[PDB]
Write a protein that binds this DNA or RNA. Structure first.
Ligand code: ADP
Ligand code: BEF
Ligand code: MG
Lengths: 107, 80, 95, 93, 504, 88, 98, 107, 93
DNA sequence: ATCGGATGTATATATCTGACACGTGCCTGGAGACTAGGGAGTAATCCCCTTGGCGGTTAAAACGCGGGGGACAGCGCGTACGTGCGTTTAAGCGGTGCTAGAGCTGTCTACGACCAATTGAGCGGCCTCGGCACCGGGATTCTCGA
DNA sequence: TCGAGAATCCCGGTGCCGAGGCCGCTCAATTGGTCGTAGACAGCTCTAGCACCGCTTAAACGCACGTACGCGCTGTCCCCCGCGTTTTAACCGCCAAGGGGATTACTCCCTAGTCTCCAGGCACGTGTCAGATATATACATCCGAT
């Protein structure tokens, strides 16, 4: 018959068969249900869509058209919940948010 | 062989200026070299443990990444 | 001349704007190799291994200095002192 | 010798979100490491969810519970919504 | 111990051979040795050391008690309530004081509300008796143990249900002649804390006293019967399997006749209608009344689970509030002064009748008693009696000790103008004396009929000279009809057996 | 009269009394306490309880039960890197 | 003239007393009502065990005792002896719980 | 033939066979080697012996003869290495080490 | 329904070290939880050591490396000594 | 405060340039079809253990009060650190060259999964006494006015 | 100023309930086989890591100096501690009902495994423009004179 990928018939962009192979060959459990990789692939695609949208906005603010890790650092550390998720993660070549304490400014 | 003196005074002041420190005392430097040496001892101990387990003699980037993940300081950017 | 506390703030703006490393390469590489001598003799480092160690060490010291700055402002000063760093490592659990 | 990654898939999602924006190689490696990290977190949490109840099969139920355990607040609701939409479209097809 | 074991079997083996069928039915120590030995081989004048007169049936009740002591066995004085079980108990102790000439260490146990009632009638009848009411804090019990209890300077100690637990270690050290327990309902369980302490004291006899027998099961009565004579029975599963719960498999009701025959030389129970002593019985109604229009919404706001966002984990209890009164749910009460008007009877169901009933009874010169299961409901009735300006007293759990005593005699005062008298069920009506009233109302029902039967006979006893008219209030088409019908199922399984043992 | 509606005033976070917080501070080694520690400590304790009870309710709902057992709380505490020994 | 102590002696005696013993320090029924009130927001009609409430109480008391130790270190560092709300805010800011 | 337990072969006291079962049915890897459970049982026996020895000495320091959990708390927190290992673990019914700060003592 | 534990083995080790000191029930539960905790830590580290090198078998060598990754200081040295002595005795017997 | 006065910072223009986006050939891992068997879903049953409320005791919380010890603001002072200039020195860039070791492939072979028969180690249940928990008396220790 | 009232520690007595120890059952560990295959090992390749050299120049080092912040000292004031008295709700026991956790039996359907086929993804060339960088120019920005 005519072949058709599971990523196509589920309406996703991330692969599904690769995630299914990584669940079986990773020794997470003995048997893997046939609805697990669709759900997991949708979750990973959603998180990647969030971070790429925020990093694209941060790159558009500095009038660049490609994404450098500084933009990823800004897009993660400005969000509340993404900073809560990636709370103990060092992004390489990242840099620090601009932050000067109030009592150090001249008066 | 006094290679810890390679972490010079202007480098520590640049690291403090990125942190937000406006004014620095003169006894920060020895304490900072001690803190840096302790942190490097822990991470390189774990990385050499991984390298000796793999029966190699070359410390890859992946071993440093695995050691930093082992201690809790996850690093994104150097493969995996 | 400028007054004390102006060039400091301008350097804070400069070094928080940028992204690159702040410790020179070869002293840090000599330091990493000297610490690695104590564990297994005659090792061999890839370049990205030393780059990973330098990136993580800079992130660690920047986080430590931010917490030290918070403690030193809490004690109604503007000048950090070694007892601030000892407190900041005492709270985090590195004792 | 080949080494697999998530490069082309992140590139597809980027072309859906921002149609006129590229991405450098270091940011591509960071997004690759991010995808692998979140995958390992969710898979490990669902694995010991299946072990804690003496089951032997990761269903979609354990993945939903692991997503509700890990992702904080407003991300959890949209993640559960996206996953339920994907599985519902997949089953009827 | 072993001589009395034969002396117990002097009268047990004088009965039928079911006792031979019970001793040899173990699954047995040297009782079989003294069993096979015997298997092969008064005061009817109302004695006037008391201060007053006895009753001619009570003289028979006294002589049954000395017959148990003459045979050196225990027993149960299970006469119907209101017949004067205290006078039979006091005169039995004065029998040992003036005939057998032994004033000994006696220990009686009562509920807390009835502790003054013993020491009043001891002083009314036998004033030669040294008696306590062991009240007080840890500071006040510190003297009375040290001063007079350890000095052995007493006759009768009147304690309560919880003080006998708090002070077990200064009471093991003194031997006893009797442990006379009024209101034998706390000992209905075998694993209870109070029963575990009572089986450690040293006693000659134990005149266990109750107004009612078993409440729910056969399992309840033997647990009372186990701590009567544990040398004899000492059985849990064997007695349950001997009788098998009123022939639950065969439905014969001819094994029950042996059970009436076991207890008939082992218990005394006489009926208030049999021996009159008031010459006038009681009536009873059940005012099946409907729900008010406000709580019809509140009955809908529970079952559909709509007021909201709270716990409803026991719907049997949550509906039981709304069947009684709406103002218990914290939000039925509308205002910031929570108001004050005729709205209160207007919102409740039973208060519509009770406002009408008391105005029918305040004219007639009646005195009512109001009972309840919930303490917080009597607070609402307290504001209602202030609203109609009625005099009362309110006895409740954890009021005080001496405040209870004052409020009884204020209501039992002659020509007292107190009209209603608020009581609870598990604390108020369990042995107090309220002959000055005539009619009794129950605001709600209970999961035990014998708890309410203990409370209905409060005013219907010796000394009452009026017609007792009991008015139960039941909410129509609600949980109370299910509870009252479930309680009635518990009643016929008991009383139709207790009807037979006195007759045969 | 008007005694029937006089006690609705608990607000169960106020059930963590002032001498209880002082007993906790005396175990912690604190000599002398300010007067504003109490509201802040109640807020901290409420946030901690919200996190742990959220995770325990999630573990309870996944097993299709309605009874939050002790192992659910121990799993929720291990989940946040606060291991509790002594309950299985 | 009665025998009053100077302010601070009873405090140190209580410090030794409560650092010697190991019982719980919050009364059980208010803590249980607190747990049930917080749990009403996540799923209605739950039903706890007793050992679950004991586990939550042990964990919460251990958390608050460690918090007051770190708060005492901060307030001694600021050359005081009095813990203040900014000390607790600092000690939770350094740990990474903001 | 005659059976003999593997713990008596290794001379240990912990069960080797139960550790082998918990590693096979724990889903840690596909195949479990024969030398792993002996080694793991020996390491667990060593750590148990260390904590019980320190708790026995701490119990003897109070003239007690049975180990209450306060003794385990003292024996863990007074050691340095066991404190570094069990640094996150809260022991139930434990208590705190007796430690008053220096400046709070009276002059 | 039975429920296994480590209680009698802990009790045997207690009778080896201190021949007279007893132990309570709550302390026995604490030691049981300790043994399960250290078991899970060492087994997890050994498992992902085997996964990093693309092996498939947990030998004794991965357990030795997991002990040298987890236990600090002199505990690592003494634990490696005890384990190597145990396996060396086991192979010859 | 303001005004010039240096001064650092940002902006617009023009020019390379190497990293990125894109097209191709190949190959291995994903999809389709099929079969077997064992996890798990559901029904039904038992009984433990949870909830709600009252009774009664009493220990702890609340409240008011006096008073002293610490928090805080201000003053002064003195020395330590920021700033800038001139001199040294070592990092950085490129360039070459060597070779040690990571990495792949092929080939046995010891070894761990799987499975059937057998049986004692461990577990639940049930007695039982001794260590720990008070209990009260007596000696010692500590802080507070002297 | 040493004595004086209160707390703590310790000693002997009592008692009580929970750990220690037997006992019977049974199921999971052991033993003895078979077999497919992950890993050990030997060998070859090729690439990236080491070491050295020379040139340049940006950055570190050292020094002076001026000022502003750390630190100590005083005074005031008011907030928390100690304590006694009264209220209130926690604690434990008791009494009901019943809901839901835990178990067992049975059937079924969903996933592991196998074989076959084929296209999506990856390594490999290649054009080409986004951004780095020099270079001139406009504009906020701190600061001494006034
Ligand atoms: N011989 C008697 N003469 C008068 N009153 C009596 C007599 N015997 C008993 N009573 C009445 O009985 C009341 C107490 O009886 P009580 O012991 O409460 O009976 P019960 O315990 O069966 O309810 C007293 O008020 C007393 O007046
Ligand atoms: F026990 Be009687 F009804 F006072
Ligand atoms: Mg009576």
């Amino acid at each position: 018959a005519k072949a058709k990928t599971r990523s196509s018939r589920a309406g996703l962009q991330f692969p599904v068969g690769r995630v299914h192979r990584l669940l079986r060959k990773g020794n997470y459990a003995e048997r893997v249900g046939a609805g697990a990789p669709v759900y997991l692939a949708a979750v990973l695609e959603y998180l990647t869509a969030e971070i790429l949208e925020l990093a694209g906005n941060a790159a558009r603010d500095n009038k660049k058209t490609r994404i450098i890790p500084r933009h990823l650092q800004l897009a993660v550390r400005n969000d509340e919940e993404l900073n809560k998720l990636l709370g103990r993660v060092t992004i390489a070549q990242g840099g620090v948010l601009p932050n000067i304490q109030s009592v150090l400014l001249p008066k | 062989r006094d290679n810890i003196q390679g972490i010079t005074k202007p480098a520590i002041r640049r690291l403090a200026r990125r942190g937000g420190v406006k004014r620095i005392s003169g006894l920060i430097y020895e304490e900072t070299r001690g803190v840096l040496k302790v942190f490097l001892e822990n991470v390189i101990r774990d990385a050499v443990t991984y390298t000796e387990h793999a029966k190699r003699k070359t410390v890859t980037a992946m071993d440093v990444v695995y050691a930093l993940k082992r201690q809790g300081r996850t690093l994104y950017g150097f493969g995996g | 001349r400028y007054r004390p506390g102006t060039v400091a703030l301008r350097e804070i703006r400069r070094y928080q704007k940028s992204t690159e490393l702040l410790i020179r390469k070869l002293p840090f590489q000599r330091l990493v190799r000297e610490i690695a001598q104590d564990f297994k003799t005659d090792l061999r480092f890839q370049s990205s291994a030393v780059m990973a160690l330098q990136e993580a060490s800079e992130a660690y010291l920047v986080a430590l200095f931010e917490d030290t700055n918070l403690c030193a402002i809490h004690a109604k000063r503007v000048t950090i002192m070694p007892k601030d760093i000892q407190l900041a490592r005492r709270i985090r659990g590195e004792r | 010798t080949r080494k697999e990654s998530y490069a082309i898939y992140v590139y597809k999602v980027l072309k859906q979100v921002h149609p006129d924006t590229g991405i450098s190689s270091k940011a591509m490696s960071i997004m690759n490491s991010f995808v692998n990290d979140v995958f390992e977190r969710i898979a490990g949490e669902a694995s010991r969810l299946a072990h804690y109840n003496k089951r032997s099969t990761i269903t979609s139920r354990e993945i939903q519970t692991a997503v509700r355990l890990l992702l904080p607040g407003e991300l959890a609701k949209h993640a559960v919504s996206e996953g339920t939409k994907a599985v519902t479209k997949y089953t009827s097809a | 111990d072993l001589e009395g074991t034969t002396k117990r079997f002097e009268h047990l083996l004088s009965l039928s051979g079911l006792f031979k069928h019970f001793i040899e039915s173990k699954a047995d120590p040297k009782f079989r040795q003294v069993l096979d030995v015997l298997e092969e081989n008064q005061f009817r004048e109302s004695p006037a050391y008391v201060n007053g007169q006895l009753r001619p049936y009570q003289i028979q009740g006294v002589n049954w008690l000395v017959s148990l002591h003459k045979n050196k066995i225990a027993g149960i004085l299970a006469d119907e309530m209101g017949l004067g079980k205290t006078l039979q108990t006091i005169s039995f102790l004065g029998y040992l004081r003036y005939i057998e000439k032994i004033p000994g260490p006696f220990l009686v146990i009562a509920p807390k509300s009835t502790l003054n009632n013993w020491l009043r009638e001891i002083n009314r009848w036998t004033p030669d008796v040294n008696a306590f009411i062991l009240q007080g804090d840890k500071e006040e019990r510190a003297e009375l143990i040290q001063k007079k209890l350890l000095g052995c300077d007493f006759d009768v100690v009147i304690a309560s249900y919880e003080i006998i637990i708090r002070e077990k270690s200064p009471l093991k050290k003194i031997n006893w002649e009797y442990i006379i327990i009024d209101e034998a309902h706390r000992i209905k369980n075998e694993e209870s804390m109070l029963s575990q302490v009572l089986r450690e004291f040293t006693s000659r006899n134990r005149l266990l006293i109750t107004g009612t027998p078993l409440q729910n099961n056969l399992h309840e009565l033997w647990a009372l019967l186990n701590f009567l004579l544990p040398d004899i029975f000492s059985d849990a599963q064997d007695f349950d399997d001997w009788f098998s719960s009123e022939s639950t498999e065969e439905d014969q009701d001819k094994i029950v006749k042996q059970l009436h025959t076991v207890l008939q030389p082992f218990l005394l129970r006489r009926i208030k209608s049999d021996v009159e002593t008031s010459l006038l019985p009681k009536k009873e109604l059940n005012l099946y009344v409907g729900m008010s229009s406000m709580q019809k919404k509140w009955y809908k706001k529970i079952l559909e689970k709509d007021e909201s966002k709270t716990r409803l984990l026991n719907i049997m209890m949550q509906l039981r509030k709304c069947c009684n009164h709406p103002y218990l749910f914290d939000g039925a009460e509308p205002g910031p002064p929570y108001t004050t008007d005729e709205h209160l009877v207007y919102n409740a169901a039973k208060l519509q009748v009770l406002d009408k009933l008391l105005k029918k009874l305040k004219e007639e010169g009646s005195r009512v008693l109001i009972f309840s299961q919930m303490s917080r409901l009597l607070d609402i009735l307290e504001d209602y009696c202030y609203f109609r300006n009625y005099e009362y007293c309110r006895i409740d759990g954890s009021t005080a000790h001496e405040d209870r005593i004052q409020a009884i005699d204020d209501y039992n005062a002659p020509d007292s103008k107190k009209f209603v008298f608020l009581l609870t069920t598990r604390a108020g009506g369990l042995g107090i004396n309220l002959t000055s009233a005539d009619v009794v109302v129950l605001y709600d029902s209970d999961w035990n009929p014998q708890a309410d039967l203990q409370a209905m006979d409060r005013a219907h006893r010796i000394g009452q000279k009026k017609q007792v008219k009991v008015f139960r209030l039941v909410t129509d088409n609600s949980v109370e009809e299910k509870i009252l019908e479930r309680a009635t199922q518990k009643l016929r399984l008991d009383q139709l057996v207790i009807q037979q043992n006195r007759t045969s």
